Design a protein around this ligand. Structure first.
Ligand SMILES: *[C@@H](O)[C@@H]1CCC(=O)NCCCn2cc(nn2)C[C@H](NC(=O)OCc2ccccc2)C(=O)N[C@@H](CC(C)C)C(=O)N1
Length: 162
């Protein structure tokens, strides 16, 4: 069960969402970033982007209220994560996912350093991109941000860091 403080890391961002990993670190899917971030000129931030995974490091502490959590490069295969989806209506929609393997993918012409998974009635929509994939290890670990799903809904992909 994900607690409110965890949910509160999920933040409306561009055409999708992002996740406050720590008071200074925000992660999201590259193709939702618009073309200032939370009232910071672009020169303020350490932006690292690769494979549809964007990470922002801010200068000032943007979410002092959070404890920093562990950002892993994906998760061990087979693992079950929760996808912490917020809808524009405010509904919280935690989706459980059995994580397949990490792999380079080409999805609608973009290179995704991603990890696939199977759902476990509900599925992802456009607008859900950037929502975090998480599991608890006395910790909560974030291993990905939502990037794609198949025309169906069975399989979803999250972009992972390198
Ligand atoms: C967030 O910006 C979206 C997430 C949309 C989602 O999760 N479900 C929407 C269901 C409708 N739908 C759109 C597509 N598929 N279904 C387009 C595309 N999917 C696809 O090409 O097949 C999946 C796949 C997986 C592995 C290998 C080949 C193909 C898709 O999801 N595109 C992304 C954007 C890309 C990554 C630039 C997308 O729409 N994300």
């Amino acid at each position: 069960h994900a607690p409110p403080t965890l949910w509160s890391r999920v933040t409306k961002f561009g055409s999708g969402w992002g996740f406050w990993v720590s008071p200074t670190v925000f992660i999201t899917t590259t193709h939702v970033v618009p073309t200032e971030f939370f009232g910071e000129p672009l020169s303020s931030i350490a932006i690292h982007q690769a494979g549809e995974f964007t990470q922002f490091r801010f200068s000032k502490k943007m979410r002092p209220d959070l404890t920093g959590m562990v950002l892993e490069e994906g998760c061990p295969e087979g693992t079950v994560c929760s996808v912490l989806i917020k809808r524009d209506s405010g509904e919280l929609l935690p989706l459980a996912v059995r994580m397949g393997a990490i792999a380079s993918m080409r999805i609608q012409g973009r290179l995704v350093h991603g990890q696939s998974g199977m759902l476990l009635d509900l599925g992802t929509i456009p607008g859900d991109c950037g929502a975090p994939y998480v599991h608890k290890r006395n910790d909560w670990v974030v291993c990905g941000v939502h990037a794609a799903a198949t025309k169906s809904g069975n399989t979803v992909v999250c972009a992972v860091q390198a």
